[PDB]
A paper describes a structure:
Among the most interesting of the discovered proteins was CotE, an 81 kDa protein comprising an N-terminal domain homologous to 1-Cys peroxiredoxins, a central cysteine-rich interdomain region and a C-terminal domain with homology to family 18 glycosyl hydrolases (GH18). CotE is a bifunctional spore-coat protein with peroxiredoxin and chitinase domains that are implicated in colonization. Insertional mutagenesis showed that cotE is not essential for spore integrity; however, in animal models of CDI, when CotE is absent the capacity of spores to colonize the intestine and induce virulence is markedly reduced.
Here, the structure of the chitinase domain of CotE has been determined, revealing a GH18 family fold and, unexpectedly, a peptide bound in the active site. The crystals belonged to space group P21, with a single protein molecule in the asymmetric unit and a solvent content of 48%. The opposite face of the sheet packs against the meandering segment of the polypeptide following strand β6, which spans residues 550–580. Much of the structure is covalently closed through a disulfide bond linking residues Cys376 and Cys670. The Gly-Pro-Ala segment is a vestige of the cleavage-recognition sequence, with the Met-Lys segment constituting residues 349 and 350 of CotE. The face of the pyrrolidine ring of Pro2 and the residue 1–2 peptide bond pack closely with the face of the indole ring of Trp445. Further along the ligand backbone, the carbonyl O atom of Ala3 forms another charge–dipole interaction with the guanidino group of Arg608. The family 18 glycosyl hydrolases carry a conserved acidic motif, which occurs in CotE as D477GIDIDWEY485. As shown in Fig. 2(b), Glu484 and Tyr485 form polar contacts to the α-amino group of the bound peptide in CotE. Allosamizoline is bicyclic, consisting of a cyclopentitol ring fused to an oxazoline, which mimics the oxazolinium intermediate in the chitinase-catalysed reaction. As seen in Fig. 2(c), the peptide-binding site in CotE partially overlaps with the allosamidin-binding site in human chitinase, particularly in the −3 and −2 subsites. The peptide residing in the binding groove may be an N-terminal degradation product of proteolysis.
Residue numbers in the entry: 363 to 712
Write the structure that this text describes.
């Protein structure tokens, strides 16, 4: 071994970034471990048919807030939106509608003593999920974010969830204009094969780098670079990691389901794509599942540290009820030497 993979712990080119660890939390938050995390993002507040915010199961939000009893530094954020969530094109449309949305955001912050909000509009200018869209959404989104920041002030968190493909950057968001308004861009660098079938669905959903098993232009690295090139500061990007597997458009499984029923079980076999830097499963000779494991999370957290990004997040905590992946993500940021040592217990010294 002449070329050891020596982990970065602190990047001397950006000391004083203190990258964060977050999880989106969809549903019952019983297993969330605050000790691992800097932030939790409740998913989701909805926009009802009258334009009003709605929280389905408020006790779950309250339970996340109560984690601040154990860890007062924890930030508790509410995400508004999600895939299929209607209401944003209308909310962004006019000075009146933007005021109204911002008013409701701040009322929600005050009601729950939140640390801030995440905006998850999927996506401005696109009706891919069935939601209303308009060609004015991209410019109107900037104005909406300004309306929100103006009301909530500088000392509350504002983030935007989005992607780093060229289409999002050109058609959905004005990256250079939203950058100064937001604290974080939550890069959902996964789901690359959502919407692909046949041979193109039998590809990685979240490969770090390109390989023969990846879709052209779709890699975590490409999305980060596209965002940086479009004017998002590195330190505002949070790199998203899926805690589920995908095969094309039609198959998803939680990490807990993969461990129980798929990984080296039921005819599915583990593989690691050393080029793309992600694991996958094969069955009957075919690519059969794309997911993240401890090794790929080590490599993605090293990418965060090496590239002076703002941090890392998971989608979602409840897909990993034992906090196996969450722990890896947390130590990948905060104690990478321990993660490397653990990995050398499986792969030998590297």
């Amino acid at each position: 071994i002449t070329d050891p993979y020596n982990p970065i712990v602190e990047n001397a080119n950006c000391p004083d970034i203190n990258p964060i660890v977050a999880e989106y939390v969809l549903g019952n938050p019983t297993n969330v471990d605050a000790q691992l995390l800097d932030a939790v993002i409740f998913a989701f507040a909805e926009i009802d048919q009258s334009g009003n915010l709605f929280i389905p199961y408020p006790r779950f939000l309250n339970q996340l807030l109560a984690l601040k009893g154990e860890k007062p530094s924890l930030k508790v954020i509410v995400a508004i939106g999600g895939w299929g969530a209607e209401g944003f094109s209308d909310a962004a449309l006019t000075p009146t509608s933007r005021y109204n949305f911002a008013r409701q955001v701040n009322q929600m912050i005050n009601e729950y003593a939140l640390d801030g909000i995440d905006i998850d509009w999927e996506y401005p200018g696109s009706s891919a999920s069935g939601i209303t869209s308009r060609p004015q959404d991209r410019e109107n989104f900037t104005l909406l974010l300004t309306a929100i920041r103006d009301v909530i002030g500088d000392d509350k968190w504002l983030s935007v969830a989005g992607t780093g493909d060229r289409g999002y950057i050109n058609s959905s968001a004005e990256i250079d204009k939203i950058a100064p308004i937001i604290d974080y861009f939550n890069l959902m660098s996964y789901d690359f094969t959502a919407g692909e079938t046949g041979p193109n669905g039998r590809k990685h959903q979240a490969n770090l780098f390109d390989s023969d098993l990846s879709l052209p232009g779709y890699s975590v690295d490409a999305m980060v670079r596209n965002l940086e090139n479009a004017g998002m500061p590195s330190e505002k990007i949070l790199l998203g990691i899926p805690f589920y597997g995908r095969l094309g458009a039609t198959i998803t499984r939680t990490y807990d389901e993969l461990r129980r029923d798929y990984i080296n079980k039921n005819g599915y076999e583990y593989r690691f794509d050393n080029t793309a830097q992600v694991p996958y499963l094969v069955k009957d000779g075919d690519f059969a599942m794309s997911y993240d494991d401890a090794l790929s999370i080590f490599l993605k957290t090293q990418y965060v540290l090496r590239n002076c990004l703002g941090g890392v997040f998971s989608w979602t905590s409840t897909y990993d009820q034992a906090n196996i992946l969450a722990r890896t993500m947390s130590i990948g940021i905060n104690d990478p030497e321990v993660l490397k040592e653990e990995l050398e217990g499986i792969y030998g010294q590297f």
